[PDB]
Design a protein around this ligand. Sequence first.
Ligand SMILES: CNC[C@H](O)CN1CCCC1=O
Lengths: 237, 300
Amino acid sequence: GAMNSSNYAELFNNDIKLFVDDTNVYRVTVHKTFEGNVATKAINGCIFTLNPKTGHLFLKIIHTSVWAGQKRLSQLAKWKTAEEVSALVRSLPKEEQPKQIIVTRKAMLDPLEVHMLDFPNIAIRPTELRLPFSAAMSIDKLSDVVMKATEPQMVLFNIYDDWLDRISSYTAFSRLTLLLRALKTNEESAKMILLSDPTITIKSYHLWPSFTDEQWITIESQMRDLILTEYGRKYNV
Amino acid sequence: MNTVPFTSAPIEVTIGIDQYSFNVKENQPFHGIKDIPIGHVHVIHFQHADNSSMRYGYWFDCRMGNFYIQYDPKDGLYKMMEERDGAKFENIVHNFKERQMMVSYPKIDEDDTWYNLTEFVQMDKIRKIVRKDENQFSYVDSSMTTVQENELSDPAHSLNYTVINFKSREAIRPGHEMEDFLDKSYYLNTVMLQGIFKNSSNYFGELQFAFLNAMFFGNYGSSLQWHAMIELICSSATVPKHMLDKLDEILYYQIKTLPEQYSDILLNERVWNICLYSSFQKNSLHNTEKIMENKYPELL
Ligand SMILES: CNC[C@H](O)CN1CCCC1=O
């Protein structure tokens, strides 16, 4: 059934599973037309498919040409997401295929179930967690590859960089969700925290800065402050 | 007109015959039902006075044999049986009529209700759904499960209806996933109508039989089947016009006949609101929508 605070440690056991987040698949800007009506212009999107144990991210870039001539794009986006996830699974060797796929939005359940009918033993699950994966496009390197794409493309990343050399996947996921929650609540502040000190750089093959253990504790504490603050700035407390 | 005699009525029971019913007291001198219209299937059904649990009954067609009812004190129920000695049967019936020990099938001349509820229901199809090939009549009761319910336990006592499942490979063509899930026309017209049912008459007959088993026996799996068969049509964008017109009539008479007090358990809010107000056919069931809005506006 649904994934929640109670069964949270299941994410870090040895059953292969993937989170799928579709919130950045169909992206638009809204603008005025010369006649003063409103129109949308699509921009490139991405499916965010993440193994929370290993950090492997399958970033399927959605080029705006896929929407050309199509109607009801928000509905189509869910089915396109399920089509691409199903194609990813079929592309993986049997021993790499997931045993569960957890969708971050319940509207993905039926599209993914229908696309995965060939895989009756892969469980499709919702979650009660309010995960911040929409903020993935606030990670500069991910946003850059999505916006530069001229055609459909899949790009592989490790969203944990090398953290698993020193910390557990439970702890790595907690750091990831804290960073992303911060970036979602106040992107400018979060990004200032991460890059303030110019002596700490991002390796070419990494997404985040090369913090020491002690610096991650400081960083993590600065993100928590940010989140509580904005939670006041928002609710006045 | 045909007759179903009763050997006797040893236990107090409410007897149904089609949409009619009457009470018989313990050891009351009751010897059956006469004037049963030829040309239709019929159902004779029972609810004991002591155990309202298990409604049960028998689908039959008097053109197929001479049938009678006899209580079995070991199995504790009224059983339908066939009399092969046609002379013994005519003699029995004539004696019971002369002694006026039979109730008359109480059909009003104007009244087409039973025809309208059984228009497409055939005894040959009912016997394939309910298997006991040695009898020409078919037993059904409140507890019997469907093949589909069993997949999700005795197969001899099952209802063999066609299994309808919108999230199944049978329903969804590879590469048409979104198309086939949001518009079920493929599944209705090619899978269910042409390769399984064979024509819309077999389809409607199974849909009518499922409703009648839900209404008369409270058979839950039959109710599931009835709603699935409605929803498959309403969720198809491409339906033959004659089928939509006939469905509106079928459902109108079903809703008309439903006991006002059982609508809470026999009508699925989600299916009906979807079918009448969201589906491709939301504007195609005028008679059904009108009676539903005037009889059960709460459900909607
Ligand atoms: C006994 N199962 C039969 C299914 O429910 C519908 N079918 C199959 C062929 C003709 C017909 O009416």
